[PDB]
Amino acid sequence: GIGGVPGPHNGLTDVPGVRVGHAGRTGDGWLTGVTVVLAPPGGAVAAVDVRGGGPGTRETDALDPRNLVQTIDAVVLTGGSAFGLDAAGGVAAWLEEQGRGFPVGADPSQVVPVVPAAALFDLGRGGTWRARPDAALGRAAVEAAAARPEGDPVEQGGVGAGTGAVVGGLKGGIGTASVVLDSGATVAALAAVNAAGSAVDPATGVLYGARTGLPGEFAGYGVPDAIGADTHARARARLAEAAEETARRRAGGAATLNCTLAVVATDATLTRAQAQKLAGTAHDGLARAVRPVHLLSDGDTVFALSTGRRPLLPGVHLEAGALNEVLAAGADVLTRAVVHAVLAATGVDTPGGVHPSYRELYAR
Amino acid sequence: IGGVPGPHNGLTDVPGVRVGHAGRTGDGWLTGVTVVLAPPGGAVAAVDVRGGGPGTRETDALDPRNLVQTIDAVVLTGGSAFGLDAAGGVAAWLEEQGRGFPVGADPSQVVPVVPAAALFDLGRGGTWRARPDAALGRAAVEAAAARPEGDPVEQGGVGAGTGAVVGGLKGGIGTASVVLDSGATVAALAAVNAAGSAVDPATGVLYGARTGLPGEFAGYGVPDAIGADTHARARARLAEAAEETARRRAGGAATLNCTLAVVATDATLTRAQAQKLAGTAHDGLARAVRPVHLLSDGDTVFALSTGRRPLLPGVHLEAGALNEVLAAGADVLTRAVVHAVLAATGVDTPGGVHPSYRELYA
Known part of the structure; x- marks a missing residue:
């Protein structure tokens, strides 16, 4: 079997033709950004499953299976909560300039780009409340994507939409993972992890997702397999200290919006x-x-995106068996991408928040 | 009363909720029905179906837009789609009790809304056409009704769990509860019949175990650490049972699998x-x-709410209170699944050989 191993760079671009671009702003009151996933020319089949309704989503109805538009070219993940949906307008503008979208005239230039987007809440985490992604930052991210070659490693950690992301008080970020199936297809995920809940088991300090990892894939980040009780006690204390200082800096505790975003392909x-x-x-x-x-x-x-390059099958339900392998892998690559995000992060300390990284607490 | 289980660690810790099983084992049979019966007056109910059965009933009636918000009974049954016949016996019993949506000036004139979901357990007793019928559904709701409030829930190979198999191991009914800081209780009952595994294949540890509350699994007598050799022997045992099950059935593992649950x-x-x-x-x-x-x-x-305690006695207090219920709901289902796996005892019939977790690891 060739399956059960990561693709070449262990990330979303191991699905051939997929490109990923980040653009972000850090310093001077800012800590936010945009991540665009750009399908290869001709677009990809796309769908969505939203739980908790943002706020900050765009063009999710267009991805119902009943609907006219058959493929899309870009998905936009952004900081700035609902305001950061503005970034998607810059991506649509770029796509129109490229002649990429639903054709609406006999002239190939006349297209309507369907650009789904979802936003995460990171307001004020750089220090300046009104510092959110705009059309120009969205355009910058999709231009960055377009400039990469196929199969280019994806930058992780505090970049793009992950720039201002926080998970359970720890610094969150962008993470990605992939797996090759026995059929030779690749399934992969990219996540911007910004959740209310914890990536860490509060009893032990172990990352919940770690046991879903493929053998050795996290070795390069340098965390021990056994976490000492004393280390975990000190980490919990440091996280509570950061949380209390963050609440003082924001004149109030932890936001009532989080929002965690992913693309599986x-x-x-x-x-x-x-x-x-x-x-x-x-x-x-x-x-x-x-x-x-x-x-x-x-x-x-x-x-979820499919580039449609490989057939699913290259009282017996063979198609269902093949889809089940993709479905199981989709969950796993997302769990793995979340762990990568948490490990890839480095901590921040700004007037809008103090958020140490997992490794700053547990690898040191 | 605050991050610990309710009195019996199960669904009937939600006051007024009752649970009834009725099953048939032997003579070619291994199946049954479980009914969750709300207290008189009914309960607010909702559903989230992922996979569409097959074998669901009255799911559309539970949409938030629809006329009837509250119901009296939920039916979980073996027999796959055929086992939906059990829900008609429950509807008949409810009518006799005068419990349903009122459709006449006469209080006998009701329409009971009885949602149901079925799991695939066909042939696991030996006889292919051995499935729950209206009479077995009636028997399960009558059993529910005869129980006192707060009665401990029977677990393992009972009711809808009777023919349940999870990852080739014996599945069954499991249940768990937790008391919130507010004093409200959240609980779940599961019939676990999944294709996937409850057991980490690297270690033999139950995936759900780490969501357990202190001590709740200890009465089942499994070791704290599982030896690599125990786990090796277990894997081989289970692989041989799956091979033999396949010979006996003339084909491999069931296409159709599921987990059914009620959270309350x-x-x-x-x-x-x-x-x-x-x-x-x-x-x-x-x-x-x-x-x-x-x-x-x-x-x-x-999901059911008996509506007996209000949620509350920049600041989003209601959201916080609901979030506690939502996070609990996931945890009690994780824990209920582990109880199902631990409470099960193995089976060996002409339609399958399915050892229990404890037979392999305890």
């Missing part, structure tokens, strides 16, 4: 309804990495 | 809040079983 061919099932099932991966999840503050959104 | 609380929820609860509860299923929600898993969670 595969090159196995899926119908739109199969992609919708994948987006739903991939939420399970989030549950295995973070607890609790899907609270009222958690506007969690997962988009 | 006495905290007052609107239908939409209860629908959110049914959704969060599915997260608890994910933490206990991997994978879940496959194309062929008909996983269904019903």
Whole structure:
């Protein structure tokens, strides 16, 4: 079997043709950004499963399987909560300039780009409340995506939409993971982790998602397999100290909005309804990495994409068996991407928040 | 009363809730029905179905937009779609009791809304057409009704759990509760019949165990650490049982699998809040079983509120209170799944060989 191992860079771009671009702003009151996932020319089949309704989503109805538009070119993940939906307008503008979208005239230039987006809440985490992504920052992210080659490693940690992300008080960020199936298809995920709940078991200090990891994939980040009780006691204390200082700096505790965002992709061919099932099932991966999840503050959104390059099959239900492998992998790559995000993060300390990273607490 | 189980650590810790099982074992049979019966006056109910069965009934009636917000009974049954016949016996019993949506000036004139979901257990006793019928559904709701409030729930190979198999191991009924800081109780009852595994395949540890509260699993007598050799022997045992099960059935593992559950609380929820609860509860299923929600898993969670305690006695107090219920709902389902796996005893019939977790690891 060739399956059960990560793709070449262990990330979303291991699905051939997919590109990822980040643009962000840090310093001078800012700590936010945008991440765009750009499908190859011709677009990808796409679907979505939103739990908790943002706020801050755009064009999610267009991805119903009943609807006219058959493929899309870009998904936008952004900071700035609802205001940061403004970034998607800059992505749509770029796509129109490229002639990419739903064709609405005999002239190839006349297109309507369907650009789904979801936002996460990071307001004020740089220090300046009104410092949120705008159209120009969204354009910058999709231009960054377009400038990369196929199969380019994805930057993780405090970049793009992950720049101002926080999970359970710890610094969150962007993370990504992939897996090759025995069929040779690749399933992968990219997450911007910003949840209310914890990625860490409060009894032990172990990352919830770690036991879903593939063998050795986290070795490069340098955390011990056994966490000492004393280390964990000190980490809990430091996190409470950061949380109390954050609440003083924000003149109030922890925001009542979080919102954690993901894209799962595969090159196995899926119908739109199969992609919708994948987006739903991939939420399970989030549950295995973070607890609790899907609270009222958690506007969690997962988009699913298929580039349609490989057939699913290269009292016996063979198609169902093949889809089940993709569905199971979709959850797993999301759990794994959340762990990568938490490990890739480095901590921040600004006038809008003090958020140490997991490794600053547990690897040191 | 605050992060500990209710009195019997199960669904009937929600006051007024009753649970009834009726099953048939032997002579080719291994199946049954479980009914969750709300207190007189009914309960606000909602549902979150992932996979569509097959074998669901009256799910549309539970949409928040719809006329009838509250119901008296939820039916979980074996027999796959055929086992939906059991719900007609429950509807008949409810009518006799005068319990349902009123449709006449005469109080006998009711229409009971009886949602149901079925799991696939066909042939697991030996006889293919051995499935629950209206009479077995009636027997289960009558059993529910005869119980006192706060009666401990029977677990393992009982009711809808009778023919349940999870990851090739014996599944069954499991239940768990927790008391919130407000004094409200949240609890779950699961019939676990999943394709996925409750057991981490690297270690033999139950995935849901780490969500357990202190000591609640200790009465089942499994070791704290599982030896690598124990786990090796278990894996091989289970692989041989799966091979033999396949010979006996003339084909491999069932296409159709699922986990069915009811989550309940006495905290007052609107239908939409209860629908959110049914959704969060599915997260608890994910933490206990991997994978879940496959194309062929008909996983269904019903959520009930008895409406006996208000949620509360820049600041979003109601949201905080609901969040406590939502996070609990997932946890009690994770814990209920572990109880199901631990409470089960193994079976060996002409339709399957399915050892229990404790037979392999205890």
